[PDB]
């Protein structure tokens, strides 16, 4: 008279299938990308242009000597 099945206490667990979490898609991407990339080239032309100014100063000390 000592046998298994309980009178109660059950679930069940699902048979389902779901993890579609979105996700920042669909014109949200391709907009943060271009907005990041244009910040890069804007951070250029303030350094590459400025280094060309110091470049001419480096040639300047050459030319003020050599006679």
């Amino acid at each position: 008279k000592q046998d298994m099945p309980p009178v109660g206490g059950y679930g069940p667990i699902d048979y389902k299938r779901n993890l579609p979490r979105r996700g920042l898609s669909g014109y949200s991407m391709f907009a943060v990308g271009i907005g990041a990339l244009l910040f890069g080239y804007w951070s250029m032309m303030k350094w590459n242009r400025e280094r060309r100014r110091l470049q001419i100063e480096d040639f300047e000390a050459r030319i003020a000597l050599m006679p």
Binding site: R49, R52, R53, Q55, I56, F59, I63, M66
Partner: protein
């Protein structure tokens, strides 16, 4: 033809991204006035040495003192 730019971008968006960067690259140097400053910066970077000239009649400009108001306008870069 207006569907062809949307019914090949559902099949192969690989070369479409190439032509989009191939285009809008040849077009822009004919557009912005930032170019020809790219040739203006690149012209007044002295590599060699400035040899002087001689007075003979003229005397056009630019006497023996360099810091006089004598030469052309390349001093807009320090203000830039």
């Amino acid at each position: 033809v207006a569907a062809f730019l949307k019914n090949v971008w559902a099949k192969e968006p690989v070369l479409v991204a190439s032509f989009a960067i191939a285009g809008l690259a040849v077009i822009l140097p004919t557009l912005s006035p930032y170019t020809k400053y790219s040739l203006m910066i690149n012209r007044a970077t002295p590599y060699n040495y400035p040899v002087p000239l001689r007075d003979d009649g003229n005397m056009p400009d630019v006497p023996s003192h360099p810091q006089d108001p004598q030469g052309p306008s390349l001093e807009w870069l320090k203000r830039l």
